[PDB]
Input
Amino acid sequence: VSLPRMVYPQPKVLTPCRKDVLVVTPWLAPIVWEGTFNIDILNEQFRLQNTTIGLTVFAIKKYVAFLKLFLETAEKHFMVGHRVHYYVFTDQPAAVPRVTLGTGRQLSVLEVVSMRRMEMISDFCERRFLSEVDYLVCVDVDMEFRDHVGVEILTPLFGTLHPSFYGSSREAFTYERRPQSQAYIPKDEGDFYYMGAFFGGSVQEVQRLTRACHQAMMVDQANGIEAVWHLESHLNKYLLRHKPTKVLSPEYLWDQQLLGWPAVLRKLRFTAVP
Output
């Protein structure tokens, strides 16, 4: 459908807002920073498609303690105005807190180890996710939303710049460096260091990613090697070879106690818990 008439400031071709950071990758994917997007336009575009976003977390053993703050803050900040389906995978269904949800938002508790996590997405819940949501977003539970995380992130496949490495040279990236591992990346390769804690995309692309990562992890297991940073290492190999269609800035994965609040971050949207 057509967008309706909208009144907003004209984009200025010769006076770009963000001159301090790279806002597009060399394969022409946007890198999402505050000041690159008009959220009203994006909200219109995605609401006209009746977009449903699946937010998936694993909360095992003591990590169930983090669910209340995670879900409460997601209610304030994550995809507000859009349809949201939370999928909470846990070994303790009874410890999932009772959190009040806004309209058009639902929560499913799925009762159940990075390889086990990939199995849930690509195998056990494959049909379900295809039937229920348009996009899947995969995050860690020991986190809280502090600001807007919305449809600006949505795209066929995204990763997020790891907050410790966004300013680093590729030699410093903690990729798997042993050629015996399927996640191996040599010193002269690499675009970015993506964090394992925040990635997503269309259901089909996230399933493709998890299927590929699971295969790679099984091959490594058969060869008696475990990648240095586990899923994160495999995600980085996958995203090197299959370029993401958006990259999220570190606004989307931050640790203020560890890293402060640098000028390059206008907002701190999703953060580690103090």
Q: What stands out?
A: Helices lie at 39-48, 67-77, 114-124, 126-132, 203-222, 231-241, 256-259. The CA atoms of residues 43 and 151 lie 7 Å apart. The chain is about 25% helix and 20% strand. The longest strand covers residues 52-59.
